[PDB]
Design a protein around this ligand. Structure first.
Ligand SMILES: Cc1cc2nc3c(=O)[nH]c(=O)nc-3n(C[C@H](O)[C@H](O)[C@H](O)COP(=O)(O)OP(=O)(O)OC[C@H]3O[C@@H](n4cnc5c(N)ncnc54)[C@H](O)[C@@H]3O)c2cc1C
Ligand SMILES: Cc1cc2nc3c(=O)[nH]c(=O)nc-3n(C[C@H](O)[C@H](O)[C@H](O)COP(=O)(O)OP(=O)(O)OC[C@H]3O[C@@H](n4cnc5c(N)ncnc54)[C@H](O)[C@@H]3O)c2cc1C
Lengths: 253, 253
């Protein structure tokens, strides 16, 4: 019939293909360059989703995401290129994670086989944490503040605003938030939540009732951690619905 | 330097590439066939591990794992082929999971985008469970029984033998064990364990002491669930060490 659900195969697709680029030689040979290029070209033919194939092809033939011999120069250039392609897809989907190229380098380099000290167990322990540790998507603080009132009105208790309070103090600056020890907790919390909703078919936007059009309680809890399942357009749309409800409420009482 | 740790990129590699095969048309065109074949041929050039590339190439040029136009006939033939390639690698590593082609079909088909009823949330809920639900490796009951005595002697309490007791009653028949409701629990338990050991650098074989050469307590708990981090050769080796210790003990007392 159709292709496969993007949220099922997507992450494995990225993790594996980013790993492929970090397995590229520091000094490829004309042969290596040709072998990898052809691989990445063929990748565009097999992604199990038509639209995905089209966007990817478009991306690899324009701008800085263009697959060219300069990209294939070395490991740095190849890994930087795929990092950019990944950003290109994120932007297309209007979702952000706030990861710098350096972040991606520190992550995948910890995967590098270090047959020193077969790789030692304490070294792999570190690698595995980096593999299992998921980076949840980010939403700017100015967007989230539009949901605080309704979150309170719907009964979400005080403990759920803790992280938001920390973020406010740091002016919603992600580069600073990422340096906080609690950033690790933020990601683990958001991940369990996102998984909880996915596994229990919990929608992000209220389908019926008075709250129709605004975030569900679980989605609100995610937003309070500057995370969300919604993309930029969907968040702004949710904000507009929340304000329709607040405005109309004010005028009737 | 080297390639990347196989246990970090491997699973994403399989999940994504199996998803690729299920995204293959029911009736490919000469063009499709050529496009996918070239992709899978190039896959062998980019796996971030030299030995892995060699084995894969060897596999796709011999026996039933050979990449040929007959394989590329349709979705059934292509998915059956990659399932066989996966089995080939499992056999090379001497690790088993007991998954039939049908098992793999039921799993990946649940990933198929079903734009009926954008795919509905309750449908995705099912898909996500299949994605997150990991199948832990299996070890035959006759192998495991060699570790029961030492497991008892080392203080492992009774609750850890529960599943083993169920398995004994079913004659260690995996096709029957997989039909049990507790099979789902078995896999979740083994998965957390395997992850716990990986994340905490807990070895599978005692490095020092009197128990040197035999499974560590955590490894023993896994074995009691007919699971293990050890491959066939390593399990038989562990058995031999356990018997050296039992035999020598008997003769000195
Ligand atoms: C080549 C390719 C093309 C795709 N094209 C589409 C498409 O057009 N449409 C569509 O709907 N889906 C597409 N997808 C899937 C989509 O990109 C997501 O993977 C999917 O929506 C799942 O999202 P997620 O939130 O579950 O996790 P993911 O987005 O898969 O994973 C989140 C993780 O991504 C990492 N990350 C984020 N940004 C970067 C970066 N720049 N570099 C490295 N790691 C980063 C973080 O560490 C975070 O933990 C594509 C996937 C691939 C592999
Ligand atoms: C193309 C390729 C070649 C590889 N070659 C090597 C190699 O030569 N040497 C090496 O050390 N590593 C190799 N690896 C990696 C290795 O196969 C494992 O993925 C890795 O050891 C991680 O094992 P794991 O136990 O963490 O999980 P994994 O083995 O990655 O995942 C376990 C999951 O595999 C699924 N599964 C098991 N059998 C099948 C099957 N036949 N069909 C579909 N799903 C199945 C189960 O559902 C189970 O949950 C290769 C990986 C790929 C993608």
């Amino acid at each position: 019939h159709n292709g496969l659900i993007t949220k099922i195969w997507g992450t494995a697709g990225w993790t594996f293909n980013h790993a492929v680029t970090f397995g590229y030689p520091l000094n490829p040979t004309s042969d290596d360059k040709r072998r990898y290029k052809n691989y990445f070209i063929s990748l565009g033919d097999v992604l199990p989703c038509r639209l995905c194939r089209e966007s990817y092809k478009k991306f690899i033939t324009t701008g800085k995401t263009a697959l060219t011999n300069e990209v294939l120069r070395n490991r740095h250039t190849l890994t930087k290129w795929f990092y950019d392609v990944h950003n290109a897809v994120n932007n297309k989907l209007e979702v952000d994670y706030g990861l710098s190229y350096e972040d991606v380098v520190n992550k995948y380099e910890s995967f590098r086989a270090k047959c020193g000290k077969v790789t030692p167990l304490d070294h792999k322990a570190f690698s595995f944490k980096k593999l299992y540790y998921m980076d949840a998507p980010i939403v700017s603080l100015d967007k989230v503040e539009n949901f605080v009132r309704i979150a309170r009105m719907r009964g979400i208790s005080d403990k759920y605003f803790a992280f938001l309070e920390l973020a406010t103090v740091l002016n919603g600056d992600f580069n600073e938030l990422k340096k906080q020890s609690s950033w690790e907790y933020r990601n683990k919390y958001a991940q369990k939540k996102i998984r909880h909703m996915r596994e229990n078919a919990i929608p992000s936007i209220e389908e019926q009732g008075y709250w129709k059009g605004t975030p569900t309680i679980d989605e609100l809890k995610l937003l309070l951690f500057l995370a969300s399942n919604l993309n930029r357009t969907e968040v702004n749309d949710a904000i507009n619905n929340v304000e329709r409800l607040e405005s109309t409420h004010y005028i009737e009482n």
